[PDB]
Amino acid sequence: SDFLFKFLVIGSAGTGKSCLLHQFIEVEFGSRVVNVGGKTVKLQIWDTAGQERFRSVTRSYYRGAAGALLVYDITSRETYNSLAAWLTDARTLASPNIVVILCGNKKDLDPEREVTFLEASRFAQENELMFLETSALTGENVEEAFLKCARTILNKIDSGELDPERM
Numbered sequence: 001s002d003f004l005f006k007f008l009v010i011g012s013a014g015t016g017k018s019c020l021l022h023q024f025i026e027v028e029f030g031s032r033v034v035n036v037g038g039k040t041v042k043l044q045i046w047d048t049a050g051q052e053r054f055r056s057v058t059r060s061y062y063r064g065a066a067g068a069l070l071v072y073d074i075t076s077r078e079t080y081n082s083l084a085a086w087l088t089d090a091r092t093l094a095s096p097n098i099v100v101i102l103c104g105n106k107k108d109l110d111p112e113r114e115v116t117f118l119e120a121s122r123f124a125q126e127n128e129l130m131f132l133e134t135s136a137l138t139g140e141n142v143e144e145a146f147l148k149c150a151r152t153i154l155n156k157i158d159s160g161e162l163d164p165e166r167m
């Protein structure tokens with residue numbers, strides 16, 4: 001493979017993080033080789049193993065990660081309000097250069113929506129994050145979130161924003 005990246009999927013317990021991973025590959029981790037611009041990027045995506053339901057997430061989970069999905073549940077504002085803390089954790093325990101794509105998950109549960117597309121998209125813009133709404137149940141935008149994250153990493157490598165020899 002031309003690139004090897006450790007990826008996270010972070011956010012509140014119950015937001016669909018493990019289902020996003022399972023949808024993307026098919027669980028402690030998963031790996032999948034994706035083609036971006038004729039280059040194979042091998043992703044090793046670490047699952048939190050439910051630890052965030054019970055305690056702080058171990059810092060060894062974040063360490064060395066190049067990219068992350070930051071996930072909230074569109075039906076739960078409480079998960080949405082938690083995003084800054086997860087993002088700060090990602091940037092402190094992984095690195096300030098982790099590429100993070102915001103995912104409003106459970107898009108298929110639009111009737112019971114509590115977070116608007118537009119307030120979430122403003123959050124992303126304000127925080128230098130790409131944004132998509134996703135469903136792990138149907139699969140809508142799941143592959144694309146992972147692809148967008150990987151694609152952004154390679155663009156920043158290409159433009160000299162990210163030093164690939166330090167990743």
Ligand SMILES: Nc1nc2c(ncn2[C@@H]2O[C@H](COP(=O)(O)OP(=O)(O)O)[C@@H](O)[C@H]2O)c(=O)[nH]1
Nearest residue numbers: 012013014015016017018019105106135136137
């Ligand atoms: N309706 C719907 N349910 C989802 C979606 N993603 C996850 N879930 C459900 O939400 C619950 C928790 O998902 P899980 O992957 O374990 O979330 P995690 O704790 O953040 O890893 C499960 O009952 C899932 O089936 C989705 O996109 N739509």
Ligand SMILES: [Mg+2]
Nearest residue numbers: 017018049050
């Ligand atoms: Mg999980």
